[PDB]
Design a protein around this ligand. Structure first.
Ligand SMILES: Nc1ccn([C@@H]2O[C@H](COP(=O)(O)OP(=O)(O)OP(=O)(O)O)[C@@H](O)[C@H]2O)c(=O)n1
Ligand SMILES: Nc1ccn([C@@H]2O[C@H](COP(=O)(O)OP(=O)(O)OP(=O)(O)O)[C@@H](O)[C@H]2O)c(=O)n1
Ligand SMILES: Nc1ccn([C@@H]2O[C@H](COP(=O)(O)OP(=O)(O)OP(=O)(O)O)[C@@H](O)[C@H]2O)c(=O)n1
Lengths: 190, 191, 195
């Protein structure tokens, strides 16, 4: 099956992705941003070198890069999970991290939203930073906006909208990760 | 005045639809789900024998039976209410009951959303279950919120009304919620 | 850059618009409804005496009037702020204040939503009723519902056309009068001049 996987940044989504790729063989976990960056360097090497450089392309070139990345991802046969962000915050507001062509090419079966507790998000972000400074309301608003984006994409393309709740206190560290991964594989095997 | 009536399952939507069909003249109350089930069954008599078996069909064939159901119920003239669910929950999450083709084929004027109180919903569901006629507060409220989002998206795309009848208040007597909703819908139709 | 400023009516949106016009140079602030009314009067002077008379129209002609108003608004060159509504409460429910033709013709860089505290909304509605004209009055929950529906409309237009969705929070309590207006104007200006 095919699912997009999303959530606010810095909350532990990458750990979920890697522990999924670790605890299932018939699975492919890919990052839309990584494929976008690869296709960009291959088509526009004279300009691109790091993720940060993907901003300098015009919106038409960036759209074509997203389209080609979605295509290359489309040629995957096994159970697929596409890690990405539905919305990202900017000085102008929330900007969608996807485009309708992405979904109608990848044609995923569903969209999975990892909804964490804002306090936990702040804690994880601060920890990883010691290795942006939002508040609880900012993160809650971001998650509700992501809900709305997912529901819009679903209404347009008719797909599933799974909301995985990780807003409960962990009994042991990294438990949210295991709960998310176990429920995701339960979905994949049914 | 053709409207799409929706709400979380097991809360009282069907009683509202029935009392509408009984109290309103020149009003056709049609169940999108039953029509889809019938059409799918008759066009694929081998693979389809229960309602939720309609998920095995490939994307194209399911969308085609939905298109045929929408065309069939669009032929109805005058005023009609379409009983249906805007989203149903499954092991894979929330799944929509409509598609843009369905909406612009039925070309409805508005979408009515019956938003109940989750406690009332739990009570109704269990009372029905005990009578052999067939989630948590948080889950029900999330379902209603995603239904609201779906309805707003459909309205933004097709330009239609989004009526939200709020039955979250405690009843003073049985069937007060459904009576209030039916009367609001009838004053809407007559307006 | 082009932004569509919106929010529930009677809460101070036009105050923000007029003060933006008064503070920042090279900023054109246009009211979609005003343009629509002018064009309606132009093409149908036999029926349109005032704004509400626009209900007399059939929906197709009014939609085309909206399209012509959006066209005229798109002809503007520099920084633009289109004051309008994402939804309107009617007997039949919420109706979108925009149409897809508006989004496509204006190509707005973003949408902006002023989210108020319903108490302030009600108080300002009743005050502007007292001190002047503007002859179904809503409640707190109704206003919250309206704001959430507008948020959903905005996210939908963004997901469909890929534009920004800025939410300016004016829910906190004002320490002095018109503080929300100053805050909204300052934030919109900071956003426009961002480099
Ligand atoms: N249950 C968890 C999951 C994650 N973390 C911490 O939170 C951060 C996770 O970051 P990451 O998974 O990389 O965040 P994303 O949401 O995936 O976004 P980005 O690529 O920007 O990091 C790390 O410090 C990780 O140790 C944690 O403390 N407890
Ligand atoms: N105001 C109400 C509305 C409903 N009910 C009870 O709730 C059930 C009616 O729900 P129904 O309208 O049948 O819900 P559906 O929309 O039919 O949901 P489903 O498809 O799951 O049945 C019946 O037990 C009815 O007595 C009630 O007690 N008071
Ligand atoms: N921070 C603010 C902003 C506005 N107002 C009051 O709110 C009233 C109504 O706001 P208005 O300026 O009329 O803005 P709109 O919301 O755009 O009104 P309408 O939709 O009726 O045009 C005004 O009289 C103004 O004094 C206020 O008290 N405090």
């Amino acid at each position: 099956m095919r699912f997009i996987l999303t959530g606010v940044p810095g909350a532990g989504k990458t750990t979920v992705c890697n522990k999924l790729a670790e605890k299932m063989s018939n699975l492919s976990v890919v990052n839309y941003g990584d494929v976008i960056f690869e296709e960009a360097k291959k088509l526009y090497p004279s300009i691109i070198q790091v993720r940060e450089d993907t901003r300098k392309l015009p919106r038409a070139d960036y759209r074509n890069i997203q389209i080609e990345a979605a295509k290359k991802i489309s040629l995957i046969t096994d159970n697929l999970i596409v890690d990405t962000h539905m919305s990202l915050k900017t000085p102008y507001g929330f900007y969608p991290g996807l485009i309708p062509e992405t979904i109608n090419i990848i044609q995923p079966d569903g969209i999975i939203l990892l909804e964490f507790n804002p306090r936990d998000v702040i804690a994880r972000r601060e920890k990883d930073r010691l290795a942006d400074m939002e508040s609880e309301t900012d993160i809650l608003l971001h998650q509700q906006v992501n809900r709305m984006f997912a529901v819009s994409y679903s209404a347009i393309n008719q797909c599933y909208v799974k909301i995985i709740d990780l807003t409960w206190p962990q009994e042991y560290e990294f438990q949210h990760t295991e709960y998310a991964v176990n429920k995701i594989i339960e979905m994949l095997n049914f």
